[PDB]
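Ligand-bound model needed. adenosine-5'-diphosphate.
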Amino acid sequence: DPKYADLPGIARNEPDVYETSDLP
Amino acid sequence: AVQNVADVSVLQKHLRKLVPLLLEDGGEAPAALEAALEEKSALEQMRKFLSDPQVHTVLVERSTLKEDKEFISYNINIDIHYGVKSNSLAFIKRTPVIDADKPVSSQLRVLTLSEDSPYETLHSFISNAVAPFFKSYIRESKMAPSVEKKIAELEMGLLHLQQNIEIPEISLPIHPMITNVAKQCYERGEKPKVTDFGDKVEDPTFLNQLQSGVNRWIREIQKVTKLDRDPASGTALQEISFWLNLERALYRIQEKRESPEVLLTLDILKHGKRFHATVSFDTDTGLKQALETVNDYNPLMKDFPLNDLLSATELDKIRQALVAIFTHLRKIRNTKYPIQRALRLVEAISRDLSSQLLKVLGTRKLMHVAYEEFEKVMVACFEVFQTWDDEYEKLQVLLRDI
Amino acid sequence: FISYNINIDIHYGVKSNSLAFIKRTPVIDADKPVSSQLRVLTLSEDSPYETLHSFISNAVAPFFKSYIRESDKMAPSVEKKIAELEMGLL
Amino acid sequence: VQNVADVSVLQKHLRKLVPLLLEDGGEAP
Amino acid sequence: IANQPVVIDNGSGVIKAGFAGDQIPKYCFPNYVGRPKHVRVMAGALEGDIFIGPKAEEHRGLLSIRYPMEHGIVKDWNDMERIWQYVYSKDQLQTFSEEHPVLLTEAPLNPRKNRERAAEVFFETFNVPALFISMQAVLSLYATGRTTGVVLDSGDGVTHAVPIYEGFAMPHSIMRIDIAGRDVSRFLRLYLRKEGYDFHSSSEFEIVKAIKERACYLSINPQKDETLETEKAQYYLPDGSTIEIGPSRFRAPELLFRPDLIGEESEGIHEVLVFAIQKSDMDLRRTLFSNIVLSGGSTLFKGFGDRLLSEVKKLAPKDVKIRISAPQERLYSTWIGGSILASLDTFKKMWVSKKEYEEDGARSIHRKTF
Ligand SMILES: Nc1ncnc2c1ncn2[C@@H]1O[C@H](COP(=O)(O)OP(=O)(O)O)[C@@H](O)[C@H]1O
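Prediction:
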């Protein structure tokens, strides 16, 4: 989108939410 | 500005070009439009619409006389009345010199005060095409904005004072492409998830169009949850009628908007992060507000002895209606209605009661015929008066309890 | 350029004209005269603001004046706002 | 549900009415 | 209405602006002070002396860039009014103070005098018809769609967390430590002098800011990675001089987690948020483990989120769900949340009327914002 174009940029190759290991 | 303008026969001919298809039974130059814009006074009117700039229209009303075959004939004068006894079809003199030099229609118009109500036909024709021409004129880039706002406000007030129903339905146009996806995801994949749309996510213009459509639905929510009227216009029964009507109207609209297809489209827009429409749609909800309101009033807003008043030829039955109504009123503990609105309500009904008393007592000829007849009828009236009095006093006591 | 089209698109430019019979009974039927019960609307070849002012002044001044001096019910305010809009557009 | 001016009906009425509302009377221009 | 509200996204160092319902602020620029320092003889220079824009970002060798917003708390309010007049410039807004509603962004738990003086500005100098200031956390949740959460952020020298479920009144459940990147940049400059690179000017410092925010990360294993050998890759100045990586670009931002190295007993975001969790209630803390509303523009560096999650792993007990709000446009998201907030129905009652200022203002301002 032009939203990310006209601005300095959003997240690069990394999401927002993460997750702990299985069976914490 | 015209001197050797078109003849009165030519004047009635142009008047017939506009008036025979509407104010008459179709066709060319008939005798009705001829008598309308061809007589001596009509010749002076032709000179006023062609040889003068003051007359901005030539009122050719579609008058009719029934009780024979309504003689539907046009009458061209300066009497552009509303639609109350004739369909006023005025030859709008848009230009002063509507003569034989220029065209008889390009230098004019046909403004017509239709056979319907002036406010109804005015609001209808206004909102249909009058606001569009001036809207395009102003839309081509205020005074033009105030004029368009006045046209829209006039159509709103005209439809309000004209249409007493005033509660239409609400259109929810799902975008046809999305409906196509729903059909393709309706054959055996009946639930249209996000994935099927795919590249449709990058449609901020298209999804913005849909966002705007939902915004119109929001405007409709405002239209639904925007008004109630003073508990004095006509009988209060009319109000109770629209109370319940608006209750199931709200519920109907609720079931309409609860179509999971529309909701699903909103979910897609939600995925598109257009939180604007979603949240604003949720905030405009006066839905449960109004629903709960009429659900609150709803027990007392149901099964009221309304025809007992209109079905009481005797004062005894009048008193029966009084008791039935006041006892029906007692459902207050579950409604929470205003004191003033209730006063105005009971007072309007009380004036209606007096009117029914006029309806029953107006043919007694008390001062004309046997005096004892008046004695008996007035004793029954006394019964009505005191029953209204003391039972109303009991209502007052219950109001103290309220 | 002569561009006559029988549609519901009521557009207006600097010299765009039109011709309509906005049916009082909106369902234009062939079983009866569809042109009979129709409040006509024929946009002349003049300016849209001037055409709108002349049309408003020709269809709401004496009509709401007569419906205000007699009789729907909001003809006085309708005539006031209509005359104001007509004079303002003029 | 179907009381509508037909394509030929509405076309003929609009053609016979466009000249009366666009010129000094006459038939379909 | 043409009198559309004005969304002003402040910040200790950055500020944005726009109208209601808009999705991108068409005006984004910093927060500073500037004035010339030399003497010309030949005319043809720029005048106004307090510039904001390419000329300001070009004639840096002339102006004296300062920062009145001490941890956001501004002191040169007059100069801010000048800036706000620039906000109303011929290329900026062209509107008048008495023409639009104004929504303002803020940082909590500030003295009343701040809002007082601001009300004086926008109601006497400027004369705003509808002015309102609130918490960006709500706007953040609006921009993310969530309703309940622990909203944490970082400005430039300001950091704070707001763990609250749906805007419920929990003032005792709020933490704030205002310290961030500006001093880290000065600390970077300190490292520079430590290996022979002295800098002192305002513009010079801003270039260092660009270096910092341009080149910084977080090596997850401090001691371990320290034992290893670096790269010290060099970036080049406008002239083109040595800018090595050094221990700096990863060791210096860790000071935000070991704040005692600056010589100040503090706790570090992690412990701060943990205390905020302790400020909450056991019958809600599970949701709060899921409620991880992160934000802050300074936070946008490498080795940040996931390493901080490892910090949480060391802190939080078993069974915790990572649900981090983290697009890089969280700054803009505040502005956007305020934009949608402005585009509302109840918003009319939400603001402060101008006549209310004419009557009393102050106490009513504190009453409407609470
Ligand atoms: N590349 C970057 N990575 C991380 N942070 C940055 C970067 N560039 C700028 N920043 C910082 O992010 C901060 C934005 O957070 P914000 O809350 O807007 O700060 P402020 O409150 O000072 O306006 C700015 O102060 C800026 O110094």
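Chain D touches chain B at residues 13, 16-17, 19-26 (CB under 8 Å).
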